[PDB]
Scaffold this active site. Structure first.
Site, PDB file in Angstrom:
ATOM      1  N   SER A   1      -7.864  -6.680 -10.827  1.00 55.21           N
ATOM      2  CA  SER A   1      -7.712  -6.041  -9.523  1.00 55.21           C
ATOM      3  C   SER A   1      -6.803  -6.857  -8.611  1.00 55.21           C
ATOM      4  O   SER A   1      -6.088  -6.294  -7.783  1.00 55.21           O
ATOM      5  CB  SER A   1      -9.077  -5.808  -8.862  1.00 55.21           C
ATOM      6  OG  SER A   1      -9.777  -7.016  -8.640  1.00 55.21           O
TER       7      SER A   1
ATOM      8  N   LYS B   1     -17.855 -10.226  -4.108  1.00 61.02           N
ATOM      9  CA  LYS B   1     -19.179  -9.627  -4.003  1.00 61.02           C
ATOM     10  C   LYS B   1     -20.303 -10.506  -3.489  1.00 61.02           C
ATOM     11  O   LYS B   1     -21.319  -9.980  -3.044  1.00 61.02           O
ATOM     12  CB  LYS B   1     -19.591  -9.025  -5.339  1.00 61.02           C
ATOM     13  CG  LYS B   1     -18.796  -7.797  -5.695  1.00 61.02           C
ATOM     14  CD  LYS B   1     -18.748  -6.833  -4.521  1.00 61.02           C
ATOM     15  CE  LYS B   1     -18.516  -5.400  -5.012  1.00 61.02           C
ATOM     16  NZ  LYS B   1     -17.227  -5.175  -5.724  1.00 61.02           N
TER      17      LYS B   1
HETATM   18  C1  LIG Z   1     -16.335  -5.780  -6.089  1.00 68.17           C
HETATM   19  C2  LIG Z   1     -14.920  -5.915  -6.604  1.00 68.17           C
HETATM   20  C3  LIG Z   1     -13.862  -5.320  -5.872  1.00 68.17           C
HETATM   21  C4  LIG Z   1     -14.274  -4.604  -4.636  1.00 68.17           C
HETATM   22  O1  LIG Z   1     -13.300  -3.962  -3.893  1.00 68.17           O
HETATM   23  P1  LIG Z   1     -14.207  -3.358  -2.687  1.00 68.17           P
HETATM   24  O2  LIG Z   1     -13.310  -2.419  -1.746  1.00 68.17           O
HETATM   25  O3  LIG Z   1     -14.723  -4.457  -1.848  1.00 68.17           O
HETATM   26  O4  LIG Z   1     -15.490  -2.599  -3.288  1.00 68.17           O
HETATM   27  C5  LIG Z   1     -12.542  -5.426  -6.339  1.00 68.17           C
HETATM   28  N1  LIG Z   1     -12.295  -6.114  -7.484  1.00 68.17           N
HETATM   29  C6  LIG Z   1     -13.284  -6.704  -8.213  1.00 68.17           C
HETATM   30  C7  LIG Z   1     -12.954  -7.454  -9.476  1.00 68.17           C
HETATM   31  C8  LIG Z   1     -14.631  -6.620  -7.791  1.00 68.17           C
HETATM   32  O5  LIG Z   1     -15.631  -7.189  -8.500  1.00 68.17           O
END
Ligand SMILES: *Cc1c(COP(=O)(O)O)cnc(C)c1O
Ligand SMILES: *Cc1c(COP(=O)(O)O)cnc(C)c1O
Lengths: 335, 338
Positions: free
Chosen positions: B279, B57
Site C-alpha cells: 500500500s 493500525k
Molecule cells: C490498515 C491499513 C491501511 C489503512 O488505510 P486506512 O484508510 O487507514 O484504513 C493501509 N495499508 C495497510 C497495509 C494497512 O494495514
C-alpha cells in the site's frame, strides 16, 4: 488513569538513517506482578526494534559503514562485505542502499529463514553456511572471498570493529537521559557484546555505581569460561569471546536456558503486550531474577530488548504453549 | 554531509501503548531523481511502521478500545471481537493485552497463517472460518457469535467506527507540526479511510488549500465509482465504500495498478533504503505523480506509509527482480500520460 500517546517528533529526517536511535524505554508490569518484586523496584525495557529495520543492529550497520566512509576505509568502487547472524546483515543492507554501496553477506541457514529473506530486496548479494558452523560459516566465508579480491572490499568485522561498540554510547546516553540518571542496573544479552560494552563504558563515565550484567546461553556459556555449545537463542552465543569484549566493564554474567528464554518471551508478549524476540526473553528473565534480590529493592533496572518476535515466526518461539496462571508461569521461570 | 541519528526521547513509558503515534516524517531522495520532478518540491513519507506493531493500525486498535473503555461500551466481563486478518487484528490484540481484555479475531482458515501466529502470541482467540468463504465467512461467524451471545462482545467495527477516524487527528497534528505548517498535499492509500479522512478533517482546520488525495487499487476503483475487482495491494481495496468515508474531504482519487505499487515498493527500499509495504508503494507512486505536476512545484507532499515490507515476505512483493538502471525503473513508473 489516562493514556497519552506520543507527541510529534518536530523534525523532518533527511534519510532513514536519521531515524535510528532514540528508542523507547518502557515499564514492564504484567511479568513483574510477583510477590518478591517490590513496587518500588522499576524494571524497564529499551525497545530496539523501534529502529528503522526493527533491530538494535541498525545502530551498528550505520555506524560501521558511515565511519568507514568518512575514514576512507570505504570509498567509491569498493563494496561492503560481512558475515552475520542476521540483523547486522540487514542493517548493512539498509546503510548500503542509502550510501550507494553494494553489500555482500554470508550467514548460517539455521538462524531465521526470514532474515535471509530481507537482504535481497535491499540490493544485497548473499551466501549462507552450514548450521553448527556457528561462525566458521558466517565469519571465515568472507575471509576467503576477500582474499583474492584485494582492496575491493571493506569488511564490517562486527565482532572486532570498535565502531560497533562506539554506536552504543548513544544507546547509553539514551538510557541515562530517559531515566534522568536513575539507572542502577543494565542487563544485556550478548552477541558481539558491542551493546553491553558500549553502554557500560559510556555509563560508567557518568556514574560508576551502575551494575552491568551480561547474559548468555546456558548451553554455550563462553563468557563464563565454557566452550561453544549448541543453543536456540538467536542473536547471541556466538561461541567465542568477541575481540571488542572487555570483561573489566561487566559486573556479572547470567546464563539462561534457551527454553526459559523462549518461555519468558511468551509471557512478556502475553502479559505486557510487548512482542520481544528470543534474546530479549533471556535478557528480561535475567533482569527479573535481579529484581527479586533483596538488595535491588527500589532500584531502576534497564534491559535491552534487541529485536521483535515477528522476525521469529518461522521458529518454535511461539509453538509450544504454557500451562498454568501468570503467577504460575512466573514461578516456574524464577525458581 | 552530516548524518545525525535521533536524540533520546527523554521519557519513560507506562506501557507499550504510550509509544503509539509521533511517527517520523522522512524525506525521499533516490526515487525523486527523475527529470520531471523539480528540485524545489518536497516529497516526504510518514513511516507508520514505527508504531509498536509496525503499522498505522496501532493508532486505531488503541483508540477504539480506549474510547470504548472510556464511554462504557467496553467493560469488565466483555470481550473484544472483530473479523480481520490484517494489521487491525494485531492492533486490537496489543490493546487487549495491555488493558487486560480477551480478544477474538475471525479470519479465513487458509490465509495469513502467522500473522495468525502473531495474534495467537498475544493470546488472541482465533476464529478460523471456511477458506473459500473468505472475509464474508468470518464476518458471518462474528455476527453469529454476537447474536447468540448478546451483550458479551464489543465489535471493533473498523470500517464504521468513528473512533478510527478520530485517532488520525493525531496523525494530522503530527504532519502539521513536523512540516511547521508547510504541508501542501497529503497522499493516503485507503483501507477503512480512517487515515485519509481523520487527517483531512483536522488539517483543513489548519489552513485553506491543503490537497487531500486518496489512493486505491486501479483494479477495484470503488471510491471512483468503478466496480469491485481482484487486486494485489494488501491493506486497501476493501471492495466497498467504508461507512466512515466522507467524499467531501477528498479532493482527488488516484488509481494505482497492483504491480506498479509493488514495483514502487521495491524501488523505494532499493534506492532509499526504506522497506515499505504494498500500500505504501501505491501511495508513493501516486505521490510522485503529483510531484511532477507543474502546479505542484516547490510544494511539500506528505505520503502515508502504512506498513513495513517485512510483513510481506510470503507474498510476491520482492519475488520479481526488476531489470534496468535506477533511472530506467523510475522512468518506467512515471511514463503514463494525461
Ligand atoms: C490498515 C491499513 C491501511 C489503512 O488505510 P486506512 O484508510 O487507514 O484504513 C493501509 N495499508 C495497510 C497495509 C494497512 O494495514
Ligand atoms: C545482533 C543481535 C544482538 C546483539 O547483541 P550485541 O551485544 O549487540 O552483539 C542481540 N539480540 C539479537 C536478536 C540480535 O540480532
Amino acid at each position: 488513569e489516562q493514556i497519552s500517546i506520543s507527541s510529534p517528533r518536530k523534525r523532518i529526517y533527511h534519510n532513514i538513517l536519521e531515524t535510528i536511535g532514540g528508542t523507547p524505554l518502557v515499564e514492564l508490569h504484567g511479568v513483574t506482578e510477583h510477590p518478591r518484586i517490590k513496587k518500588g523496584t522499576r524494571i524497564l525495557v529499551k525497545l530496539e526494534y523501534f529502529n528503522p529495520m526493527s533491530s538494535v543492529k541498525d545502530r551498528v550497520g550505520f555506524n560501521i559503514v558511515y565511519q568507514a566512509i568518512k575514514d576512507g576505509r570505504l570509498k567509491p568502487g569498493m563494496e561492503i562485505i560481512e558475515s552475520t547472524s542476521g540483523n547486522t546483515g540487514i542493517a548493512l543492507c539498509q546503510a548500503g542502499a542509502v550510501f550507494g554501496y553494494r553489500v555482500n553477506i554470508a550467514m548460517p541457514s539455521t538462524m531465521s529463514v526470514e532474515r535471509q529473506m530481507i537482504m535481497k530486496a535491499f540490493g544485497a548479494e548473499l551466501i549462507l553456511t552450514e548450521g553448527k558452523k556457528g561462525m566458521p560459516g558466517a565469519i571465515e566465508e568472507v575471509n576467503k572471498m576477500i582474499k583474492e579480491n584485494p582492496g575491493k572490499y571493506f569488511v564490517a568485522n562486527q565482532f572486532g570493529n570498535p565502531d560497533n561498540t562506539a554506536a552504543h554510547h548513544y544507546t547509553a546516553n539514551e538510557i541515562w537521559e530517559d531515566t534522568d540518571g536513575e539507572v542502577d542496573i543494565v542487563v544485556s544479552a550478548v552477541g558481539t557484546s558491542g551493546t553491553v560494552i558500549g553502554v557500560a563504558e559510556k555509563l560508567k563515565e557518568k556514574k560508576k555505581g551502575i551494575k552491568i550484567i551480561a547474559v548468555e546461553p546456558e548451553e554455550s556459556a563462553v563468557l563464563e569460561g565454557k566452550a561453544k555449545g549448541p543453543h536456540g537463542i538467536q542473536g547471541i552465543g556466538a561461541g567465542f569471546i568477541p575481540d571488542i569484549y572487555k570483561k573489566e566493564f561487566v559486573d556479572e554474567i547470567i546464563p539462561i536456558k534457551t527454553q526459559d528464554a523462549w518461555k519468558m518471551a511468551r509471557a512478556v508478549v502475553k502479559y505486557d503486550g510487548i512482542m520481544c524476540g528470543m534474546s530479549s526473553g533471556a535478557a528480561i528473565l535475567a533482569g527479573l531474577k535481579e529484581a527479586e534480590k533483596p538488595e535491588n529493592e527500589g532500584k531502576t533496572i534497564v534491559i535491552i530488548v534487541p529485536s521483535c518476535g515477528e522476525r521469529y515466526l518461522s521458529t518454535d518461539l511461539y509453538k509450544i504453549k504454557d500451562e498454568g496462571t501468570k503467577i504460575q508461569i512466573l514461578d516456574s521461570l524464577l525458581n
